[PDB]
Design a protein around this ligand. Structure first.
Ligand code: CL
Ligand code: CL
Ligand code: CL
Ligand code: CL
Ligand code: CL
Ligand code: CL
Ligand code: CL
Ligand code: CL
Ligand code: CL
Ligand code: CL
Ligand code: CL
Ligand code: CL
Ligand code: CL
Ligand code: CL
Ligand code: CL
Ligand code: CL
Ligand code: CL
Ligand code: CL
Ligand code: CL
Ligand code: CL
Ligand code: CL
Ligand code: CL
Ligand code: CL
Ligand code: CL
Ligand code: CL
Ligand code: CL
Ligand code: CL
Ligand code: CL
Ligand code: CL
Ligand code: CL
Ligand code: CL
Ligand code: CL
Ligand code: FE2
Ligand code: FE2
Ligand code: FE2
Ligand code: FE2
Ligand code: FE2
Ligand code: FE2
Ligand code: FE2
Ligand code: FE2
Ligand code: FE2
Ligand code: FE2
Ligand code: FE2
Ligand code: FE2
Ligand code: FE2
Ligand code: FE2
Ligand code: FE2
Ligand code: FE2
Ligand code: FE2
Ligand code: FE2
Ligand code: FE2
Ligand code: FE2
Ligand code: MG
Ligand code: MG
Ligand code: MG
Ligand code: MG
Ligand code: MG
Ligand code: MG
Ligand code: MG
Ligand code: MG
Ligand code: MG
Ligand code: MG
Ligand code: MG
Ligand code: MG
Ligand code: MG
Ligand code: MG
Ligand code: MG
Ligand code: MG
Ligand code: MG
Ligand code: MG
Ligand code: MG
Ligand code: MG
Ligand code: MG
Ligand code: MG
Lengths: 171, 171, 171, 171
């Protein structure tokens, strides 16, 4: 047992490792979207940069879980980072729809971890999730939802002019 | 009943007073460690200053509970501040080991108070503990644990050169 | 065929994708080493930060290959990022030895890619590797080798004082 | 024989002169496109300025070959600069398509010169092409390809609104 460990359940330690993996998975998915929008036959650089930034953000979320694990006396256990579900992302609307679903998946896992922390009576873990993860998640979900609404308004997927306009005025 | 009092259980009020006393006890223990490391026959000034700073920090934690008590309409009730368990602290490793245990004792009392606040449905008290106490406690426990690991690495208690090196490069 | 593509062999495109994966693998390995040295029972923060920085550097090397692929009209194809070979890294000397071998593995793959680019008569790819990868690789290999020599001098693995001294004066 | 000449093949000297001419040809073509987009019945000033800048860049590439020739002890031999293939350029998409093909023609000639330099074992010439020409060429080809993708998205040639939008947000 780690000398620092106090009120940290084995189940929570394991769940933090799984959450770490999911953040890395989300980072990798966003990097794929960056790569797609940077293609010469897609060429929406502002959209590409949006996803690149989100990839970096998710990597930071992962690192924060690693630091958290060590602070509590848990042990970081890494697994493979699975490749993204798609190799190509269609267009801005398809990619944003995929990002929304990914963000909701990450949010559900955060909420599930919070429920586990509540069940195991771990207020430090609860506070960590609430203070560092849960609000940023709601904000990102709202931003992507707003984008989707605008892309539909702009006539995506069919309306190429609309897609250009979004890249030039929204991101 | 205080005109400001709302959703503040008598049990929580009493527990806040006991927590106040424990913070003061912890401050006094750290001041003892400061005094020890300042002895001419111990003479580890950087270690002494580390404990002096921690003593000041704990006094501030105590004052914050006094302010909290009044904000909720509870009444501050003081008891004797018991002298520290030891008059002399052996060496840097022994003192850090004692500090780790003290910090875990304080942490357990904070967690117990949080459980009481949860049971009495007092989210303001829960938030206070989470926002002002619980994370600082985990950080301090981690820092002291890291120090202990390094002091053992440096060959404490036997290795006097190791003890000198710690005082000159870690604190 | 991409409208931008010129003098870019399918074999080179595929090899760039494999190199991308290896950079990501190397980044993940360094993040594991960071996590290890941040453990309360290891506690060598400067060593941890060294590996954290290297993890970030490798991620940047990967992103540069993604950008390269798109510039040439190739298509980024991602695969799983395999977890590191070890879950724990022993000590500073063991970790540095593993880092040296990892850096030489990455270097060999860069040299193999350069040989392929030479065979396919692709000077742009050759220049890219020479200007952006090959010298940084030699410098990093030299730095790690120098560290290993010093860790052996300091009596690693047995000499804990030596390990402390390295963390405090070399990184 | 020039007193400075060393390891500089007659074939390479002649090929450098031909490359000089091609850079000047490319500069003249871009100046034609500038003139076209500046017409009162075309009136896409930002597009015009893009081509004007590229014309200036190509002239600089030509001057760099003149300086190179003299540095190696070769002799600059000039030929006529042929007028551009077209007197009018249709629209932004047609012009960008022509620019892409021109840039690929220039790139092929640079690659052919690099192959000649390799065959004649002239690393100075190889380095010059790699360091001063080959990457700028790939970047320009990528930029023009990205523009073409966007112009098609915007509904060129038919969609005049799309053409206006490109001139106002992409260049
Ligand atoms: Cl525990
Ligand atoms: Cl508890
Ligand atoms: Cl696990
Ligand atoms: Cl980071
Ligand atoms: Cl797996
Ligand atoms: Cl796909
Ligand atoms: Cl948050
Ligand atoms: Cl109140
Ligand atoms: Cl009340
Ligand atoms: Cl209530
Ligand atoms: Cl009381
Ligand atoms: Cl004060
Ligand atoms: Cl008493
Ligand atoms: Cl005593
Ligand atoms: Cl706190
Ligand atoms: Cl803890
Ligand atoms: Cl090709
Ligand atoms: Cl070729
Ligand atoms: Cl591939
Ligand atoms: Cl980056
Ligand atoms: Cl795989
Ligand atoms: Cl292992
Ligand atoms: Cl380099
Ligand atoms: Cl010469
Ligand atoms: Cl010669
Ligand atoms: Cl020679
Ligand atoms: Cl000639
Ligand atoms: Cl000039
Ligand atoms: Cl002629
Ligand atoms: Cl014409
Ligand atoms: Cl260049
Ligand atoms: Cl190209
Ligand atoms: Fe995000
Ligand atoms: Fe964030
Ligand atoms: Fe995240
Ligand atoms: Fe996210
Ligand atoms: Fe965000
Ligand atoms: Fe403290
Ligand atoms: Fe504090
Ligand atoms: Fe305290
Ligand atoms: Fe404390
Ligand atoms: Fe503290
Ligand atoms: Fe590195
Ligand atoms: Fe680098
Ligand atoms: Fe690398
Ligand atoms: Fe590396
Ligand atoms: Fe490096
Ligand atoms: Fe150009
Ligand atoms: Fe240039
Ligand atoms: Fe040129
Ligand atoms: Fe050009
Ligand atoms: Fe250029
Ligand atoms: Mg467990
Ligand atoms: Mg998972
Ligand atoms: Mg798979
Ligand atoms: Mg509850
Ligand atoms: Mg709560
Ligand atoms: Mg909170
Ligand atoms: Mg917040
Ligand atoms: Mg009462
Ligand atoms: Mg008490
Ligand atoms: Mg007594
Ligand atoms: Mg906080
Ligand atoms: Mg292929
Ligand atoms: Mg591989
Ligand atoms: Mg495996
Ligand atoms: Mg060769
Ligand atoms: Mg070469
Ligand atoms: Mg070079
Ligand atoms: Mg260099
Ligand atoms: Mg000749
Ligand atoms: Mg010619
Ligand atoms: Mg003619
Ligand atoms: Mg260069």
């Amino acid at each position: 047992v780690s000398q620092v460990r106090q009120n940290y359940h084995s189940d929570c330690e394991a769940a933090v490792n799984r959450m770490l993996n999911l953040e890395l998975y989300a980072s990798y998915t966003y990097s794929s979207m960056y790569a797609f929008f940077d293609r010469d036959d897609v060429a929406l650089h502002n959209v590409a940069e949006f996803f690149k930034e989100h990839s970096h953000e998710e990597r930071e979320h992962a690192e924060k879980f690693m630091k958290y694990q060590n602070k509590r006396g848990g042990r970081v256990v890494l697994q493979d980072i699975k490749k993204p579900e798609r190799d190509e992302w269609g267009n801005t609307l398809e990619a944003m729809q995929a990002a929304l679903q990914l963000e909701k998946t990450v949010n559900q896992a955060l909420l599930d971890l919070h429920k586990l922390a509540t069940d195991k009576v771990d207020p430090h873990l609860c506070d960590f999730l609430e203070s560092e993860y849960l609000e940023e998640q709601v904000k990102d979900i709202k931003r992507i939802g707003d984008f989707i609404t605008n892309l539909k308004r702009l006539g995506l997927p069919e309306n190429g002019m609309g897609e250009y306009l979004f890249d030039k005025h929204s991101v």
